[PDB]
Write a protein that binds this DNA or RNA. Structure first.
Lengths: 130, 106, 125, 32, 168, 87, 183, 196
RNA sequence: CUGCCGAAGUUUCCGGAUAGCAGAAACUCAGAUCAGUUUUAUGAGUAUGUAAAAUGAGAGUUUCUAGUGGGCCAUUUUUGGUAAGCAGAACUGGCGAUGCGGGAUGAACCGAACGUGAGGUUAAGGUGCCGGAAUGUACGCUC
RNA sequence: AUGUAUAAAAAUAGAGGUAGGCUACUCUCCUGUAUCGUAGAAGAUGGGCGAUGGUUGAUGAAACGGAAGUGUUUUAUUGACUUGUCCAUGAAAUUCCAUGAAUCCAUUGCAUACGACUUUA
């Protein structure tokens, strides 16, 4: 929450989005369009990054078919370090590599995604125009 | 400390009522910063939550939440009507509510 | 006093769809209504109530009941446009107007801008 | 509080007889 | 919102009166239905023409020919009071005949507490010459150097931080 | 009944009569005390010349009952400061 | 009426400042400060002319314009010529003894109607009392404020009042004889 | 618009009922309200009329233990608290909790003289009364019906105004230095396009 | 215990019958009859009575069997009046068998007529606070 | 609680200044939609460049605050952080919302229906 993210493509229902992982460390994710604030920030190129590999099945979680879960070794498993194959870091690093020159060229883009959005005193969302 | 509060501050005014008959199913919520029914249209359908604290540690946490949704404006002053999953207690009149920014349509 | 409801005085509309628009009182209808006109085409000559406008310090030399064309000619000759802007009141209103149509990315740039502005806090001891 | 010496608001029996007083005035004018 | 309506009407043609006289009235009403009702009321009270025997031959709203020219309107009315028989003459300065009548109705209901049905407007005229003006407050309006500070200014956001300027 | 200025009609909460009002403070007068504490021993009667001008018994002897209170000197053991407040 | 105004020409008087409606009229004779907050009137100062202006005022408030005008003119007269009141003692049998203290701001009256009570009156500020030798049993009250001088005369007269006696036959008292200016 | 957890209201120049009506609703909304300078409140109507109103209020008494009768409070803050209390459901537990969130005082005591004091435009006498309308001050009304601390509040307020003025001069002098050094930084004109 | 139907609230003759209102049973009737209604026409004195289109509804009888036969309030006409009240009729209304919203509170005032619920919208009355809802807009008057 | 951020005074038919000698100047007001503050794995790890400041934690202080002063400064250190301007790592699979005295027992009688009260021990 509060992280600023770049939209890669529109899925069937969600949006495949990811902040440049070298900027804000937000992996590729499906995000429902009802939990997104579209800003008037300048558009970042996306034609240079290939998105067909980003499918609902690709993001899908392995089915369990059972209520079983909840174990210490289970939580020691998964984790950002492992249980995700090296191709996942590979394609994202390709994404950041394709995305970084675009954000670098136009000023303030890197710091903007580094910062996290939040409301302050005297902020009224219905009157502010993102 | 200015890096959070993605919600809007609100207050539980009272229940939807006549002079003598109260209808606890829907509550009247004053979203602060909203001063007309036109501005209340922005907050229609947003998710409002009532956050309170309890002695028992349910789920290892002492913080409980009652969810709800803004339905329609109430009057000309910018107050709205909200329906919660559990009808809010009458002791929460004048208490603080949290209006989320989702489901977003901006 | 410094503001008198008189023919030729420039007013700023505060209520109605023309809020923020500049006008000049062409005639005094009565104690509670006046006829105004503006050189701008989007602002039509109309009768408005004093409660909807604020009397500005600017007064132009304009004959009573001048038509729209004469009012525009007098307005351009006496350069009331940029005469109102010369006041700090207009600059504040425009600065307020510019700020409200700002967006999130501009607001982010502003905080960096004003914090670079603040980083000095250098005053001679 | 009110500074009056009488309650400006009367009793329901008092207002009821006032409508009867209004009835008397109609009787005085129309028939009597 | 009152509207000025030209209502022309006449009794239904008959053998005795194959060409009935057409009577026209300029009368103000919120809508055409009220105007035609008021027209019938005046016609009955003057010519004794029954509503059933008559018919409305034309109804037309009349806009102000010069809504952007400030004028002075003098109105003669038959005020209905406790005694129910009084004649008054008033003068209002504005840019529209409808506005003057609206001000007339508001003024009479304010000062004399007279309702719409009790009041009947007898005639409305436009006093173009300054000299025929009979009212001092109107004459003070027609002075050439009219200038005065704005009166009755008075000016959610409760709890203002500073005090109001309530001045220039 | 008697005077209503004394209607509480209850036992006094205090054995020693508390002073409720002190004489108004004046800066012009130099520093002095205003009260003392004694013990009622008893009374007797005395004969005193009546130097009362205009009285029927001017320049004459009168018998007056007079109360005697023993007042050994008091020891000033402390001081208290009082601040004026809107309360 | 939309506009009702009164115009006043100020004299050599030094300052006629009306800051916060407070008229601090300073003249060669002296200075008087008075308050005009009781009236909602515009005091516009221009050169040697002062305008009291009321816009859209009613008859009740418009009556205050002239009253404000008069008190301004009266106090201006005070700072320039001032006011002197001549009060002549009137007695039939018992002489009225008047004593002046601290240059006359307090007047002590004794032996009125034979009474043994000393009637002490303190005059209002800016009023000095003197006994003129030109005319016997004559008291002169000179000052800057016409309000203060006339009030002082009224207080002295009311103190020396005849009670329970036929005023037709008992003429005893002190009464004001002339009301004028020092120059 | 927006709330504050604690709100200090400068009652000077306000109207009794208009300020009380706003305050009572705010208390019910769950806000904590501190009203300072309750002796400077104003009431529409001339003093003698308002004095007679208070005298009529004092007249309410029983024939059995006037202690059982209404307790008439003369302090200006207590007069304001009475106005607020009649606008709350005080016989009800909700109204009782509303009252405990109100703190009306005379003058500005130390814990609040160093805090910001907002005003209520809906209750300001200048914005609500036609000029030339008679009005009275609660401090004068209180002091004439039994309040005996008008002078002490007056003296204490004069000292506070002196100390407050001295603080302002230091703040104003400081603000001028930042104001002078503000345009020294070029960035203020470099990107003033954003309206700042 | 639940459900369904559901009055009369008073004529007309000597406390009873007749009738009225409510049901049941058994019939005939839909190219038929009705109506707390309005037109049209006729006369007669804006009303009246008589007869013949509009609108609505399936419209009729027979037997026999319950309960009811008060009052109160209000409008209008009229009869007298009287310090002034009011008194006498007629008239149809409202209550009465009936909760509910409003009128601070209420047998007669304003709305509204009721299975259990969700949503929406209103009547009457309201929108400073108690109290849900504009310390709304515009024009005046009043201290 | 989610920035728990903001202390002139008075007037409203006027104020506040700046610049001047209570009087001559001009400027500002027309609410806070302001000002302060706000980038960082709830905020990680290092490296520069440029300030020579800012924000504080713990000590040591001296001046100030009495209306309810329980807080204001000035600081002398020490320990941190600094985003003022640039860089380089890390972030994830949580792979679409959920968060020491007093009392009784005694004593007194200045007190007393009984308690209480005043004493003494």
């Amino acid at each position: 929450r509060g992280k600023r993210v770049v939209v890669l493509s529109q899925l069937e229902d969600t949006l495949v989005v990811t902040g440049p992982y070298k900027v804000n460390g937000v992996p590729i994710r499906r995000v429902n369009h009802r939990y997104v604030i579209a800003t008037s920030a300048p558009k970042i190129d996306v034609s240079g990054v290939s998105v067909e590999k980003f499918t609902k099945a690709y993001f899908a979680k392995q089915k369990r078919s059972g209520p079983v879960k909840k174990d210490e070794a289970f939580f020691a498993e998964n984790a950002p370090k492992n249980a995700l194959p090296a191709e996942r870091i590979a394609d994202q690093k390709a994404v950041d590599a394709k995305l970084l020159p675009a954000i670098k060229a136009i000023p303030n883009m890197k710091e903007y995604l580094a910062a996290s959005f939040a409301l302050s005193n005297g902020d009224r969302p219905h009157l502010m125009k993102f | 400390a200015q890096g959070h509060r993605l919600y809007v501050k609100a207050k539980h005014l009272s229940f939807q009522r006549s002079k003598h008959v109260i209808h606890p199913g829907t509550s009247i919520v004053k979203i602060e910063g909203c001063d007309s029914k036109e501005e209340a249209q922005f907050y229609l359908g947003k998710r409002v939550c009532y956050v309170y604290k309890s002695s028992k540690a349910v789920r290892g946490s002492k913080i409980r939440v009652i969810w709800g949704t803004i339905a329609r404006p109430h009057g000309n002053s910018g107050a709205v009507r909200a329906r919660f999953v559990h009808n809010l207690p009458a002791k929460t009149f004048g208490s603080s509510l949290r209006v989320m920014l989702y489901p977003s349509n901006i | 006093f410094k503001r008198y409801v008189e023919v030729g005085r420039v007013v700023l509309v505060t209520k109605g769809e023309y809020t923020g628009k500049l006008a000049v009182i062409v005639d005094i209808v009565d104690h509670k209504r006046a006829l105004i006109d503006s050189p701008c085409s989007e602002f039509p000559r109309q009768v408005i109530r004093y409660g909807s406008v604020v009397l500005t310090h600017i007064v132009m030399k304009l004959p009573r009941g001048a038509r729209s064309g004469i009012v525009a000619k007098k307005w351009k000759a006496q350069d009331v446009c940029n005469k109102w802007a010369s006041s700090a009141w207009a600059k504040k209103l425009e600065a307020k107007k510019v700020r409200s149509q700002l967006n999130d990315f501009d607001r982010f740039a502003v905080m960096r801008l004003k914090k670079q502005r603040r980083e000095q806090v250098n005053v001679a001891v | 509080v009110s500074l009056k010496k009488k309650s400006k608001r009367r009793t329901t029996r008092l207002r009821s007889r006032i409508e009867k007083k209004a009835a008397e005035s109609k009787r005085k004018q129309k028939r009597a | 919102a009152l509207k000025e309506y030209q209502v022309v009407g006449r009794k239904v043609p008959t053998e005795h009166e194959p060409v009935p006289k057409l009577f026209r009235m300029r009368l103000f009403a919120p809508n055409e239905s009220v105007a035609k009702s008021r027209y019938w009321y005046f016609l009955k009270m003057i010519n004794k023409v029954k509503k059933a025997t008559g018919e409305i031959v034309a109804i037309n709203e009349i806009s102000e020919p010069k809504p952007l020219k400030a004028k002075v309107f003098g109105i003669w009315i038959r005020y209905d009071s406790r005694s129910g028989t009084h004649n008054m003459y008033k003068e209002f300065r504005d840019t529209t005949r409808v506005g003057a009548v609206e001000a007339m109705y508001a003024d009479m209901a304010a000062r004399h507490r007279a309702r719409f049905r009790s009041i009947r407007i007898l005639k409305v005229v436009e006093v173009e010459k300054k000299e025929d003006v009979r009212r001092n407050y109107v004459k003070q309006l027609l002075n050439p150097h009219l200038k005065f500070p704005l009166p009755h200014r008075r000016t959610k956001k409760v709890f203002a931080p500073h005090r109001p300027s309530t001045f220039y | 009944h008697g005077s209503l200025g004394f209607l509480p009609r209850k036992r006094a909460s205090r054995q020693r009569g508390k002073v409720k009002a002190f004489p108004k403070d004046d800066a012009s007068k130099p520093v002095h005390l205003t009260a003392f504490l004694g013990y009622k021993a008893g009374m007797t009667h005395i004969v005193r010349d009546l130097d009362r001008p205009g009285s029927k018994m001017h320049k004459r002897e009168i018998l007056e009952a007079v109360t005697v209170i023993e007042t050994p000197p008091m020891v000033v053991v402390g001081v208290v400061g009082y601040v004026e407040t809107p309360r | 009426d939309i506009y009702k105004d009164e115009t006043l020409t100020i004299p050599k008087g030094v300052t006629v400042d009306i800051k916060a409606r407070n008229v601090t009229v300073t003249g060669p004779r002296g200075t008087l400060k008075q308050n005009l907050r009781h009236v909602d009137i515009e005091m516009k100062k221009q050169g040697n002319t002062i305008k009291f202006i009321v816009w859209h005022g009613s008859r009740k408030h418009n009556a205050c314009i002239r009253s404000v005008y008069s008190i301004i003119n009266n106090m201006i007269i005070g700072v320039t010529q001032g006011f002197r009141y001549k009060m002549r003692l009137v007695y039939a049998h018992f002489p009225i003894n008047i004593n002046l203290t601290e240059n006359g701001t307090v007047v002590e009256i004794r032996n009125f109607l034979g009474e043994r009570i000393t009637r002490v009156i303190k005059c209002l500020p800016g009023v000095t009392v003197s006994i003129s030798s030109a005319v016997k049993d004559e008291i002169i009250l000179e000052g800057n404020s016409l309000e203060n001088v006339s009030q002082s005369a009224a207080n002295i007269k009311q103190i020396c009042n005849v009670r329970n006696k036929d005023i037709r036959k008992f003429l005893d008292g002190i009464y004001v004889s002339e009301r004028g200016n020092i120059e | 618009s927006e709330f504050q957890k604690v709100v200090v209201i400068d009652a000077k120049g306000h109207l009794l009922g208009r300020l009380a009506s706003v305050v009572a609703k705010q208390l019910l909304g769950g806000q904590k309200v501190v009203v300072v300078r309750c002796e400077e409140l104003n009431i529409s109507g001339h003093f003698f009329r308002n004095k007679l109103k208070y005298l009529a209020y004092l007249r309410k008494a029983c024939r059995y233990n006037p202690s059982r009768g209404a307790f008439h409070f003369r302090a200006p803050s207590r007069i304001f608290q009475k106005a607020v209390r009649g606008m709350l459901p005080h016989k009800t537990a909700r109204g009782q909790a509303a009252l405990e969130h109100l703190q009306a005082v005379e003058g500005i005591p130390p814990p609040f003289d160093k805090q910001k004091r907002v005003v209520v435009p809906a209750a300001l006498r200048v914005l609500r009364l036609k000029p030339g309308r008679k009005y009275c001050t609660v401090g004068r009304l209180s002091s004439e019906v039994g309040w005996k601390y008008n002078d002490i509040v007056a003296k204490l307020e004069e000292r506070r105004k002196v100390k407050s003025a001295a603080f302002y001069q230091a703040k104003l002098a400081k603000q001028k230095k930042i104001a002078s050094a503000k345009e020294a930084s070029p960035v203020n004109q470099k990107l003033s396009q954003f309206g700042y």
